[PDB]
Structure formats: structure tokens, C-alpha cells
């Protein structure tokens, strides 16, 4: 009855490994940003103008690209991940990249003004800047909802990295070969999450936290399909590919 098994020595190594992977792949100081193509914020309080200028696209496109590289880094240090055929590594990455980016961006997302703040001012990102990169409310509003949703779970960083690992190693992705193997890696990770929550999370009356976390992985598949729907529509804008990166192109095209 409400059993609380102690963390195995393997389960601990996994956390340590993931905690460390994240420290090595996420820069909380945002010092690489001046390297990205500069943010341009034109005036408007218009889908037409947005698509005409695409003023924020090269900055955000660089930002996402940069992050994909970071996520790729992250995945490589996931225990199990290198044991997969590099083909199941590509598939799992490409189909989760946008989700892990939405997951990881929560570190910069603040409930003070409902923005991602990586700054200073210049690297603050709100609904409007994302519109300025050619996306519509149908993605941007629900993404903000999900951000708040996630902030309120109040995840320990341990839960944050596991959640991201779990998301990457999902056996039910279009095109995976060895779902059996991938499902084994995931189970190992969820068992670590489920157990970690039970030992180390206050109160807890609410270990309900695990169900809520799995629910976030569902919300993510939605935003993923929506993002991909909208990405398609940007691709139709002429001269757009030059505003992107070779990496953003392959991952989403
Ligand atoms: C990507 C990240 C950040 C924010 C994420 C945002 C804010 C702007 C808007 C973003 C990029 C959404 C867009 C709707 C995605 C659009 C991509 C496109 C234009 C290619 O379709 C999805 C996630 C959103 C900021 C920050 O938390 C992180 C920046 C990168 N970083 C820092 N240290 N290590 N990596 C995070 O990965």
C-alpha cells in the first residue's frame, strides 16, 4: 500500500547522468545569443505584414537551430540512446526536437509577463514576436498555456531532465524500427521518474504528479502536429528557406 521503493544504484546513476547532460547542454546565461542573427521587431497590432517581412524568423530560426544542436547533444548522453541503431536515433530526434525545445524552454519562460526571457529586453520573447516569425495564435496561445501548466507542476530538475529523456525515447513515433528496444529504455526512465517522485517529492499526497507529467507529453504531440502544420505554411512563403538554417530545414521539412 503506497509502496515507496528506494532509488536503485542504477536509477541514481541515470539521474546523475541526465542532470549532468543537461548542465552540459543548457546555458542558463544565454551568452551565445549575440551570435544569432539579430532580432527585428517591426510595427503592427497582420498575417499579411508578418509574412511579408518575417522579421523575427532568422533570429528564432537560429535560436531553434541552436537548441536542436543542444537537444542532439542531450540525447547522445541518455543511457541507452547510443545502443539504438543510428537510424532510430535520427527518427527519435527529428520527431521530438520541437517537443524537447518546448519542454526545455520552460527554464527561460517566466510567469511575470508570460514571456521567455533570455536577456535583457532584446532576447525577451512574447506571443507577438512569435507571430512576427509567421506563426498564428492556434499554436502560440496553447504553447503559452502549456508553459504555465508546466511551471506550476514545480518540477525538480531531476524530473525536468527525465521528462525530456522520456519524450525523446518514445517508442510510438512514426518510422521507428525497434520499438521493443526503445520501449525498454523508456520504461527504465519512467521507472526512475515514478520512483524518484515517490521518494523525493514533497508533500506528497500528490504523486499524481506522474499522471500530470505524462499528460504534458500528450499536450506536446498536439503542439507538435500544430507546429508542423504551421511550419508547412511558412515553407510556402517565397525566400523563406534563406531565413532558416540547413538543420531547421531537414528536421521540419
Ligand atoms: C528554444 C528555447 C527558448 C525558447 C523557446 C521558445 C521561445 C520563442 C518561440 C519558440 C521557439 C516556439 C516557436 C513556435 C517555434 C518556431 C520555430 C520555427 C520558426 C522554425 O517554426 C517553440 C518554443 C519557443 C529559449 C531558451 O529557454 C532556450 C534557448 C536555447 N538555449 C539556451 N541554453 N541552451 N539552449 C530554449 O531551448
Swiss-Prot record:
Task: Pull one GO CC term from this UniProt entry.
Answer: receptor complex
Indicate which residues form the motif 9aaTAD: 246-253
Name of the protein described by the UniProt record: Vitamin D3 receptor
As for subcellular location, the record says: Nucleus; Cytoplasm
Region ranges (Interaction with coactivator LXXLL motif): 76-94
Q: How is it modified after translation?
A: Ubiquitinated by UBR5, leading to its degradation: UBR5 specifically recognizes and binds ligand-bound VDR when it is not associated with coactivators (NCOAs). In presence of NCOAs, the UBR5-degron is not accessible, preventing its ubiquitination and degradation.
Q: Biological process (GO) annotations? A: apoptotic process involved in mammary gland involution; calcium ion transport; cell differentiation; cell morphogenesis; decidualization; intestinal absorption; intracellular calcium ion homeostasis; intracellular receptor signaling pathway
Lipid metabolism among keywords: no
Keyword Membrane in record: no
Q: Which UniProt keywords apply?
A: Cytoplasm, Disease variant, DNA-binding, Metal-binding, Nucleus, Receptor, Transcription, Transcription regulation, Ubl conjugation, Zinc, Zinc-finger
Homology family: Belongs to the nuclear hormone receptor family. NR1 subfamily.
**The protein's role, per its UniProt record:** Nuclear receptor for calcitriol, the active form of vitamin D3 which mediates the action of this vitamin on cells. Enters the nucleus upon vitamin D3 binding where it forms heterodimers with the retinoid X receptor/RXR. The VDR-RXR heterodimers bind to specific response elements on DNA and activate the transcription of vitamin D3-responsive target genes. Plays a central role in calcium homeostasis. Also functions as a receptor for the secondary bile acid lithocholic acid (LCA) and its metabolites.
Binding partners and assembly:
Homodimer in the absence of bound vitamin D3. Heterodimer with RXRA after vitamin D3 binding. Interacts with MED1, NCOA1, NCOA2, NCOA3 and NCOA6 coactivators, leading to a strong increase of transcription of target genes. Interacts with the corepressor NCOR1. Interacts with SNW1. Interacts with IRX4, the interaction does not affect its transactivation activity. Interacts with CRY1. Interacts with CRY2 in a ligand-dependent manner.
Enumerate the residues binding calcitriol: 26, 67, 104, 108, 135, 227
Noted disease association is:
Rickets vitamin D-dependent 2A: A disorder of vitamin D metabolism resulting in severe rickets, hypocalcemia and secondary hyperparathyroidism. Most patients have total alopecia in addition to rickets.
Q: Which residues form the signal peptide?
A: none
Q: Which residues form the NR LBD domain?
A: 10-253
UniProt organism field: Homo sapiens
GO molecular function term, any single one: nuclear steroid receptor activity
What the entry says about domains is: Composed of three domains: a modulating N-terminal domain, a DNA-binding domain and a C-terminal ligand-binding domain.
Q: Which residues of the parent protein does this chain contain?
A: 118 to 423 of 427
